[PDB]
């Protein structure tokens, strides 16, 4: 079985003696010494440690030196890591390290030949220990006060960001609040210690996002001083002091000193084996009629099959088996309904929309245990075996015995391919009574009857009745002949003289009343399809009746007493008073808590939603209607009896009608993931910024807009301080400002927009002679040109200039400007056709002026017609070898204008010896001016203002796209198939005779919650793991006024800092000790928040737990749990109405513990279900109301502080990484419904 180590071909000497190369083979599997590495889990992969390569390289150096690692204090210089290496769960990866002993250079290859890490290393001759000082700013008399960050606190903030560091790597013990000081733990592993120092670097206050190492400038390790610099905690463990000096960019710890350790951004890769199950929690009646009628597809079919077939009284069966019978125009008639007879799960014939899940469900909580034996007769044609294994596998607490029984072995043949993965027991069965051993008694029996109708009514049911198990369930589905199609099914496929064999609603009603059943449910469709749930009842015992209306929680010791009653079969819980008595949630806990498992714990609820809805009395006629039905879950909304059910959510990303929107990418590098996101001006336009509004007729892409929508360029190399690295596209536009005026302007980002906020120092009036099109092409292009040529390269007239890519935007402009002050131009260009456009557009161009651009030939060319002197300025925007070649065209005193960013960005080498030509090299970034609009920017603007009035500057060729084809506008620009600008149009301009229009822009825009900066937002428990994140996320989406509630106040360092920092970012934050369970307390709170600004947000995250099974529960373990949630919610509902006329969000976190239940949280359950009522009330009143039933919550929940990982399987679910929660909550907030679930699936 087991295979062993066979020395390998390459294991034996194959070159010779070589002190200077080393191959390391890393094995990560649980046995290996190098298993420790599996704790360097970044974003969920196991990357081999940035630090790691240095450790190898180091090792490798002492090899060559004959010395060990502890005697060879090393120096790295200019180290650069290129890709990181992903360690596979199993197998071996090889990194090879090569040394250049004279050049001091070094390199790290991989098995595949790729470059991994390069720098310079060498023995460090005069190891100056003074380089590792640990001397402070002064004597801190602050032990016992302070506020530090605990190892837990630290990796809390990291794992939040994407760093899933594991134990052997969690070496940060303690940290200054700012992360400038602290204590790292020694492991006897440099790879760990080293990477922990990196931690601290990465660990800035208020620095978000995922950061890998990329360059060090100078690492210096001296293991002697290191042994010394180390100490021993009382723990008996070993650690030393780390210090970060961000003003000097140096991290020191023990004997390792970093310098210029530049790290950088990485893309979080969404692992879609963790997409969340989004469910809506609508109330559902048992008595649903006229169902559907919302499908344009199903109504374009009760007339396309009641129109060709109404003359006898396209895609699917009744359309294809009825039309192919009028095509040949009874023996071959059963031969044209069979090349399309398995074309029978047809949209109309089959009612798989919501109804099916609504009843399967009802059936499913009506057995003690979440295990369910299911069987399905007539399984072949009526394929319920396709849907119900899916509807059920949906819940987190499931166990399924599916059994597909069919008359023949034939009909279960196409299912061998399908039944093998749903895992379905098969057999043979014809509805004639005989229930085999191959059925052994079930729980549910399902049956599609829009089928080869069984032939017999109560004989088919005499079997289905003889496979019950105590009181299980029967789901059956017949087409009813009291409709235009119901009798038209009977005639067709069953040529039989009694083919009209499909009774009506009353006729099936007493066909069940015969087997001793009770219609549990009924789903009458509009076209005639009807769904029947049926349960047959075994006698009731002594039905105890306990009302749960009190606020006391007395009934608690009364349900703790009804656990002494032997087999008390009927024990019914029922609120009569409070329309907010969260029993539904309670039940779900007890109903599977050992004590009441088989207790048949039932519920009754009074939830009238408007005032004129009276109708709830016990002891009389209805009490017994419901006792007869026996159903576990009995609710009542304004007329209907139905439980509370879970349905899937409508998926579609909620859009909205706006006059404002900006276009963003939804996934860095995939252009399909582009759509119209909602503009934050669509949420509030506060007088302040308002006198600056501007409606856009044309927005134009530039190259940066592409390289980002692609991902060749990191949002790193974009100047500016950025709240959100998210929204970042478009900087040029043209329209009318709030004056009505006619303007063209630039914008630091979010320019691709229906509207924009005019940067006043960088908006210009567009002349009368320029269309809005032509205007929208100029701003960037020219400014980048004037800034490059004139301001920076100080170009003087009659010089020579090499402008690369003349066709381009910057190109055309460059030329125009150089030609105006009359220079010898030399341009490069890829197309034979671009040679054309240019030659035309500028007549003053010779054929000597043109060289290529996809190639190095341009150098030789410039060197010819320059007599080996070269050009005076170069405007290079080209890459690697081409940039180098562009450098060589520099004549004496010349100036390089580096507009490009790639070679720059990768810290490529520049041959310093070029600077003997008294050359000056200009790095250039227009984005470094702009927003920061200084003197220099003004200088560049009036170069535009002037060049305009002197006709130097002219609009470019505009290749214009409609606001729909925004996508292609990008790909078109991608493949360099453009000359001039690419411009996306938003408003057809206003024609001839001078119009002062006023635009009616309706636009299709995806919803994204944003916060007006004048409203104040309130989260209770705002210092709690999640709250802190909700706060963070709030500030990001705009909030300026937060009110964070907690009973104690700021007590953790990790809070101290989040709040301390938000204050520094300018956010107005207010920590409050006001408790919302007392009305006086609530008002205190809302009034608190109102002093900050009208209240727009109220999120109730507070919660105290009291875990204990029902026999430990006291009536005040119960009252404690609901005070923060039910009582708090209720008060905030009242207070909110009384005086919060600007509230948009009223949110409340529930849990799935209310949904499917949790054993030992019968109290948690109640309290939470309670809130879901109060939120439903509000929705019904047209007020914002949203309760979310979260599953396990990761990254920071009560979970991560109690139990352990994001790998903990709780309630049959997984921790939703907060990141995902936030983007879910984002979806939820803009929803109609009152109650929504969200959890991840375990296994």
């Amino acid at each position: 079985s087991q295979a062993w180590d066979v020395p390998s071909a390459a294991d034996f000497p194959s070159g010779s003696s070589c002190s200077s190369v080393a191959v390391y083979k890393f094995d990560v599997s649980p046995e290996s010494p190098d298993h420790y590495l599996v704790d360097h889990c970044i974003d969920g992969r196991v990357l081999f440690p940035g630090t790691g390569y240095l450790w190898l390289t180091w090792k490798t150096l002492a090899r060559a030196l004959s010395q060990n690692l502890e005697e060879t204090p090393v120096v790295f210089e200019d180290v650069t890591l290129h890709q990181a290496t992903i360690l596979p769960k199993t197998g071996t990866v090889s990194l090879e390290v090569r040394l250049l002993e004279a050049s001091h250079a070094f390199e790290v290859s991989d098995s595949n030949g790729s470059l991994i890490a390069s720098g310079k290393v060498y023995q460090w001759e005069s190891p100056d220990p003074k380089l590792f000082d640990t001397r402070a700013a002064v004597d801190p008399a602050d032990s016992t006060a302070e506020f530090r960050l605990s190892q837990g606190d630290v990796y809390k903030d990291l794992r939040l960001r994407g760093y899933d560091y594991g134990p052997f790597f969690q070496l940060v013990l303690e940290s200054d609040l700012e992360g400038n000081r602290g204590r790292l733990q020694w492991n006897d592993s440099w790879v760990s210690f080293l990477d922990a120092m990196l931690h601290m670097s990465i660990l800035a206050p208020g620095q978000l996002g995922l950061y890998l190492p990329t360059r060090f400038t100078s690492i210096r390790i001296d293991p002697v001083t290191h042994r010394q610099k180390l100490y021993t905690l009382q723990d008996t463990t070993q650690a030393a002091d780390v210090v970060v000096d961000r003003n000097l960019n140096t991290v020191v710890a023990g004997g390792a000193l970093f310098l210029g350790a530049h790290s950088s951004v990485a893309p979080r890769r969404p692992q879609e084996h963790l997409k969340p199950i989004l469910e809506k929690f609508c109330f559902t009646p048992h008595v649903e009629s006229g169902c559907l009628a919302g499908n344009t597809a199903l109504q374009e079919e009760l007339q396309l099959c009641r129109g060709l077939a109404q003359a006898l009284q396209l895609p699917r069966l009744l359309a294809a088996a009825c039309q192919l019978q009028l095509n040949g125009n009874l023996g071959q008639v059963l031969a044209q309904e069979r090349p399309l007879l398995c074309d029978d799960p047809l949209l109309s014939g089959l009612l798989d929309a919501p109804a099916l899940k609504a009843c399967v469900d009802t059936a499913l909580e009506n057995m003690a245990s979440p295990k369910m034996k299911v069987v399905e007769v007539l399984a072949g044609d009526g394929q319920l075996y396709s849907r119900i294994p899916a509807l059920l596998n949906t819940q987190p607490v499931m166990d399924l015995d599916y059994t597909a029984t069919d008359r023949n072995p034939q009909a279960l043949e196409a299912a061998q391919a399908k039944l093998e993965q749903l895992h379905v027991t098969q057999g043979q069965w014809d509805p004639a009574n005989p229930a085999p051993g191959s059925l052994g008694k079930a729980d549910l029996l399902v049956c599609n009857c829009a089928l080869a109708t069984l032939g017999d009514p109560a004989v088919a049911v005499g079997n289905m009745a003889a496979t019950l198990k105590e009181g299980g369930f029967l789901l059956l589905h017949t087409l009813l002949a009291g409709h235009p199609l119901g009798e038209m099914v009977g005639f067709l496929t069953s040529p039989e003289q009694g083919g009209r064999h499909l009774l009506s609603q009353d006729q099936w009603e007493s066909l069940f009343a015969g087997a001793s059943l009770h219609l549990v449910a009924l789903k009458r469709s509009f076209y005639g399809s009807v769904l029947f749930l049926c349960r047959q009842q075994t006698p009731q015992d002594s039905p105890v009746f306990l009302s749960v209306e009190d606020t006391s929680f007395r009934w608690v010791d009364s349900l703790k007493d009804i656990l002494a009653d032997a087999s008390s079969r009927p024990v019914w819980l029922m609120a009569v008073g409070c329309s907010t008595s969260g029993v539904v949630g309670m039940v779900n806990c007890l109903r599977k808590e050992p004590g009441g498992h088989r207790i048949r714990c039932v519920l009754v609820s009074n939830l009238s939603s408007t005032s004129p809805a009276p109708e709830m009395h016990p002891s009389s006629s209805e009490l017994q209607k419901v006792l007869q039905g026996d159903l576990v879950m009995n609710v009542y909304r304004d007329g209907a009896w139905g439980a509370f059910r879970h349905f899937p959510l409508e998926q579609d990303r909620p859009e909205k009608q706006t006059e404002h929107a900006f276009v963003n990418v939804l996934s860095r590098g995939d252009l399909s993931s582009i759509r119209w996101v909602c503009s934050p001006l669509h949420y509030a336009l506060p007088a302040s910024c308002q006198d600056r509004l501007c409606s856009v007729y044309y927005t134009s892409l530039n190259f940066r807009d592409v390289m980002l929508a692609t991902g060749k360029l990191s949002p790193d190399s974009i100047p500016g301080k950025w709240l959100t690295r998210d929204c970042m596209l478009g900087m040029e536009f043209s329209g009318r400002d709030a004056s009505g005026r006619r303007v063209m302007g630039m914008v630091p980002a979010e320019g691709l927009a229906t509207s924009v906020l005019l940067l006043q120092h960088a908006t210009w009036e567009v002349p009368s002679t320029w269309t809005l099109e032509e205007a929208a092409s100029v701003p960037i292009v020219y400014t980048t040109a004037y800034y490059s040529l004139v301001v920076r390269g100080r170009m003087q007239p009659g010089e020579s200039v090499l402008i690369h890519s003349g066709s381009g935007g910057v190109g055309q402009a460059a030329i125009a400007i150089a030609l105006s002050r009359g220079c010898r131009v030399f341009t490069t260009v890829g197309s034979a056709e671009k040679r054309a456009y240019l030659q035309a557009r500028f007549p003053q161009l010779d054929e000597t002026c043109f060289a290529n651009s996809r190639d190095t030939s341009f150098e030789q060319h410039v060197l010819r017609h320059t007599a080996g002197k070269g050009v005076d300025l170069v405007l290079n925007s080209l890459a690697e070898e081409k940039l180098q070649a562009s450098v060589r065209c520099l004549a004496q005193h010349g100036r390089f204008l580096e507009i490009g960013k790639f070679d720059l960005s990768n810290n490529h080498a520049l041959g310093m010896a070029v600077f003997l030509k008294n050359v000056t090299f200009h790095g250039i970034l227009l984005d470094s001016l702009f927003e920061e609009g200084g003197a220099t920017w003004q200088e560049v603007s009036e170069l535009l203002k002037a060049g305009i009035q002197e006709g130097v500057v002219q609009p470019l060729k505009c290749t214009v796209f409609p606001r729909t084809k925004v996508e292609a506008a990008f790909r078109y620009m991608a493949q360099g198939k453009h000359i001039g600008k690419v411009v996306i149009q938003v408003r057809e301009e206003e024609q001839g005779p001078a119009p002062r229009g006023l635009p009616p822009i309706a636009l299709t825009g995806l919803s994204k919650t944003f916060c007006p900066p004048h409203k104040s937002y309130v989260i209770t428990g705002g210092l709690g793991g999640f709250g802190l994140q909700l706060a963070q996320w709030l500030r990001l989406r705009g909030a300026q006024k937060l009110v964070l509630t907690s009973r104690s106040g700021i007590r953790t360092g990790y809070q101290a800092r989040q709040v301390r920092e938000w204050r520094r970012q300018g956010v107005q934050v207010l920590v409050s000790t006001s408790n919302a369970s007392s009305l006086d307390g609530a008002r205190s709170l809302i009034t608190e928040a109102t002093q900050l600004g009208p209240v727009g947000g109220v999120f109730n995250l507070a919660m105290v737990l009291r875990d204990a099974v029902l026999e430990n529960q006291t009536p005040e373990f119960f009252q404690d749990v609901s005070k923060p949630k039910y009582s708090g919610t209720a008060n905030l509902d009242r207070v909110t109405r009384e005086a919060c006329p600007e509230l948009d969000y009223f949110v409340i976190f529930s849990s799935v513990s209310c949904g499917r239940g949790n054993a030992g949280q019968a109290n948690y359950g109640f309290a939470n279900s309670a809130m879901e009522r109060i939120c439903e009330k509000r929705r019904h009143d047209g007020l914002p109301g949203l309760a979310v039933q979260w599953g396990a919550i990761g990254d920071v929940g009560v979970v991560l502080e109690t139990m352990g990982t994001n790998d903990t399987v709780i309630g049959g679910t997984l921790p939703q990484r907060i990141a995902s929660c936030l983007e879910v909550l984002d979806l939820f907030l803009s929803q109609p419904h009152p109650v929504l679930s969200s959890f991840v699936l375990a296994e």
Binding site: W4, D5, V6, P7, F12, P13
Partner: protein, 279 residues
């Protein structure tokens, strides 16, 4: 301690169990005998392999690679308290092991023997040397006898036979009539040169006056390498020693043409071809 075991030694431990039980004996019935073990081994490539990385490579590799361990560790496991020995004579070895063994039983010393032949190809260098001596067939075949012989074609093999005194054998493939070894003196044409004038002598020492009848031989299994020099020199000396006798004296063959030249394993791997075809 097993991932540091020369794969020879691994599958020796098995083939010799497979061999002891092959002949109706329970290995345990031997536990503690005066039973010996004789291994013909030329190349222990695996040993160098796990002896280069002086931080990486562990100390108990040598208890699983040192040559003697090829026999010693086979004695260690079966509890064979008699002689434990590995011999290296190059291509012969295993056959001279199977000789050295036969003698030790014959003479009283033992009651049973494990005779092993081992040779596994791991390091390409080895072969490269053999080519730079032109004893390797570019062809890559052991054309035995045929005129189309360049050199031989190296192959591997772990093989073992169990020798026993008849009054202890539950099965008998054949009986050993005689054996002996000599050694080409100082040939004037180099050390690689197979001296037939000396192989004849060996073949004599064992027959006519001090052995069986050259006339009884039905089959002689040659070495049959496929050397343009080796083949003639041998086959010539063969007839010049076994052939004053009528009928087509000895049909001749050579497993080495079927499978390659297992070098030190050749002899015993050869014997196995012989026993097999007898059965």
């Amino acid at each position: 301690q097993a991932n540091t075991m020369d794969p020879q030694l691994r599958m020796l431990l098995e083939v010799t169990y497979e061999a002891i039980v092959d002949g109706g004996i329970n290995p345990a019935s031997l536990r503690g005998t005066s039973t010996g073990v004789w291994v013909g081994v030329s190349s222990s490539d695996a040993s160098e392999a796990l002896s280069r990385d002086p931080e990486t490579l562990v100390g108990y590799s040598m208890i699983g690679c040192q040559r003697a361990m090829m026999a010693n560790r086979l004695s260690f496991f079966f509890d064979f308290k008699g002689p434990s020995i590995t011999i290296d004579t190059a291509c012969s070895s295993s056959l001279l092991a199977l000789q050295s063994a036969y003698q030790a039983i014959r003479g009283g010393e033992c009651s049973a023997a494990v005779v092993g032949g081992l040779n596994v190809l791991l390091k390409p260098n080895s072969s490269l040397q053999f080519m730079k001596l032109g004893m390797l067939s570019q062809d890559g075949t052991c054309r035995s006898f045929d005129a189309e012989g360049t050199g031989y074609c190296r192959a591997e093999a772990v093989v073992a036979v169990l020798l026993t005194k008849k009054s202890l054998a539950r099965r008998v493939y054949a009986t050993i009539l005689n054996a002996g070894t000599n050694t080409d003196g100082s040939k004037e044409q180099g050390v690689t040169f197979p001296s037939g004038d000396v192989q004849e002598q060996l073949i004599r020492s064992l027959y006519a006056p001090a052995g069986p009848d050259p006339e009884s031989l039905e089959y002689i299994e040659a070495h049959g390498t496929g050397t343009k020099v080796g083949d003639p020199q041998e086959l010539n000396g063969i007839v010049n020693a076994l052939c004053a006798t009528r009928r087509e004296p000895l049909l001749i063959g050579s497993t080495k043409s079927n499978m390659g030249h297992p070098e030190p394993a050749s002899g015993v791997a050869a014997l196995i071809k012989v026993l097999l075809s007898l059965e």
